Design a protein around this ligand. Structure first.
Ligand SMILES: *C/C=C(C)/C=C/C=C(C)/C=C/C1=C(C)CCCC1(C)C
Length: 133
């Protein structure tokens, strides 16, 4: 319920292109990223997280300690500097990324076998569902 450890296989991905567009990802690369199968690998140890979301051409990596603000440079995404902070709101893992973009961050709900991930930027929300492999 608070345990996010695992290798996570995607089963659905809603409004992916609206969220990428809100981040200003190149329209060309958007309709490549649309094609790619993603595997989310989470290593969680106490407060310390290592998140690795992987695909053929394109990976997103982040490591953080819950409750410790960190500078994040989204080099493989929109290549912006944000002030990221990840915390627990109940059993909901919440990341707020302060910077140019408003309403920017993500949330993870872990429901036994299922991981629900909502990514937000501006007025767009991308809803993803992964299953533990
Ligand atoms: C808790 C899980 C998180 C924060 C996972 C985030 C994953 C991404 C931001 C993935 C982004 C990607 C693209 C938009 C294009 C294709 C490659 C991806 C899947 C790494």
């Amino acid at each position: 319920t608070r345990d996010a450890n695992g290798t996570w296989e995607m089963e659905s991905n809603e409004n992916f292109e609206g969220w990428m567009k809100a981040l200003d990802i190149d329209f060309a690369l958007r309709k490549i990223a649309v094609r790619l199968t993603q595997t989310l690998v989470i290593d969680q140890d106490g407060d310390n997280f290592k998140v690795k979301c992987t695909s053929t051409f394109w990976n997103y990596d982040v490591d953080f300690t819950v409750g410790v603000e960190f500078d994040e440079y989204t080099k493989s995404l929109d290549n912006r500097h944000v002030k990221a902070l990840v915390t627990w709101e109940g059993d909901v893992l919440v990341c707020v990324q302060k910077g140019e973009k408003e309403n920017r961050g993500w949330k993870k709900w872990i429901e036994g076998d299922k991981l629900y991930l909502e990514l937000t930027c501006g007025d767009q929300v991308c809803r993803q569902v992964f299953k533990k492999k």
